[PDB]
């Protein structure tokens, strides 16, 4: 199965250097050409470099020329992308992709981010959102957990591990008046599972390093 | 520097209907326009390449056509998970550009939200601000009206809305409304409700709770 694993992202100061990864496997990475392109938080698909299969060539878009330096390794089956004097609309996911076609793209992989900003990490507080007891709803009920104050993007949202995707609506988070994030996650399950069934949150922001398990339930109504 | 010129930008087809995205370059590539396809939090996916070349496995609705400098892409039979955003890629020479995206949404029957009230937990009270959370579960179209009432105080300009992107199977949308207030004023009243306006409801539907009533 072609497969592209990128790694390296992060948030880096302005002026500052990182440099992304992309693994290979599946197919004879000596014959394709690579690639790096990015998405900006809400924006589309723009091309930053491109590597001949050999590495004897390569482009680079205006925007990053004489600062971002793509380069391979056929041996290992690695993709670099050197960021250097780095910007803060450098910020975006970035993809590595290639293609046995020029400048064709087949093989895509899975995103990484980048978020370029002089601003300080701050994780998240978690907090449950469940219903009081004579809340109106029929067989099915929701809980969730609200990831609040946050910077900067992403955050991971989870429920019991992972176990339990059916039903889970994780919101875009909404940039508050702070500077700060805030989004909720919410899943819809069956009322009489609500006061028994274990129901636990996975919060999980890399850049602040903070991770959190909630369990959410009702509150204490003798 | 290729320019490539996607249209429409957005469209809403129902299932089974046939979509038509278009996208033109300033300058003749001849045959080299790429296809992709991204699904809401996924990263995007090869569908067509080189005009009109596709894979084992890309649908037959996927058809791509065209050549020198006008291009399209063809979904004869719109299925719920192409709910997604469409990118055309030039690859005949350096800079390598992208189209600018087509939104498909998909157009399907009216369907009216689940509404959901949420108390601020004590944990967050605890910090001094109380958000109170409306959740309006699986509903189409995007178009709701939620407004919230403290103590029939009708509430303006203090609280924030979310819309997921469109479920890739049922086709629907989900919204959260969150009212935030701080502590002290949290306490001073006692009837909290979000009242939610939706074609799909027969009048509006109105949820809330009451503060200390565990």
């Known amino acids: 199965e072609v497969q592209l694993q990128e790694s390296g992202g992060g948030l880096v100061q302005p002026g500052g250097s990182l440099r992304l990864s992309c693994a290979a496997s599946?197919?004879?990475?000596?014959?394709?050409?690579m690639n790096w392109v990015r998405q900006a938080p809400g924006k589309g698909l723009e091309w930053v470099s491109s590597?001949?299969?050999?590495?004897?060539?390569?482009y680079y878009a205006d925007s990053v020329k004489g600062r971002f330096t793509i380069s391979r390794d056929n041996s290992k089956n690695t993709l670099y992308l050197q960021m250097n004097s780095l910007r803060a609309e450098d910020t975006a996911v970035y993809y590595c992709?290639?293609?046995?076609?020029?400048?064709?793209?087949?093989?895509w992989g899975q995103g990484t981010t980048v978020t370029v900003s002089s601003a300080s990490t701050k994780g998240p507080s978690v907090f449950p959102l469940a219903p009081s007891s004579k809340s109106t709803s029929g067989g099915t009920a929701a809980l969730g957990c609200l990831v609040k104050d946050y910077f900067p993007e992403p955050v991971t949202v989870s429920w019991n591990s992972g176990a339990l995707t059916s039903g889970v609506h994780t919101f875009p988070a909404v940039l508050q008046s702070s500077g700060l994030y805030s989004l909720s996650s919410v899943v819809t399950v069956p009322s009489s599972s609500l006061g028994t069934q274990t129901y636990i949150c996975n919060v999980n922001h890399k850049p602040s390093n903070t991770k959190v398990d909630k369990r959410v339930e009702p509150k204490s109504c003798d | 520097d290729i320019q490539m010129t996607q249209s429409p930008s957005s469209l809403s087809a129902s299932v089974g209907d046939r979509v038509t995205i278009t996208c033109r370059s300033s300058?003749?590539?001849?045959?080299?326009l790429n296809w992709y396809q991204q699904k809401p939090g996924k990263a995007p996916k090869l569908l067509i390449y080189?005009?009109?070349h596709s894979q084992s496995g890309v649908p037959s609705r996927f058809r791509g056509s065209g050549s020198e400098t006008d291009f399209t892409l063809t979904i004869s039979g719109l299925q719920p998970e192409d709910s997604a955003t469409y990118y055309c890629?030039?690859?005949?020479?350096?800079?390598?550009?992208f189209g600018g995206g087509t939104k498909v949404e998909i157009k399907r029957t009216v369907a009216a939200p689940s509404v959901f009230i949420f108390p601020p937990s004590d944990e967050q009270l605890k910090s001094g601000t109380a958000s109170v959370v409306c959740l309006l579960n699986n509903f189409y179209p995007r178009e709701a009206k939620v407004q919230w009432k403290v103590d029939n105080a009708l509430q303006s300009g203090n609280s924030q809305e979310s819309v997921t992107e469109q479920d890739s199977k049922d086709s629907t949308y989900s919204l959260s409304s969150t009212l935030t207030l701080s502590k002290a004023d949290y306490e001073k009243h006692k009837v909290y409700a979000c009242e939610v306006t939706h074609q799909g409801l027969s009048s509006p539907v109105t949820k809330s709770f009451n503060r200390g009533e565990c």
């Open positions: 300058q003749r590539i001849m045959t080299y």
């Open positions: 992709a290639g293609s046995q076609y020029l400048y064709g793209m087949d093989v």
């Open positions: 590597i001949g299969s050999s590495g004897g060539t390569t």
């Open positions: 080189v005009g009109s």
């Open positions: 890629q030039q690859s005949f020479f350096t800079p390598l550009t």
């Open positions: 599946g197919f004879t990475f000596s014959i394709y050409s």
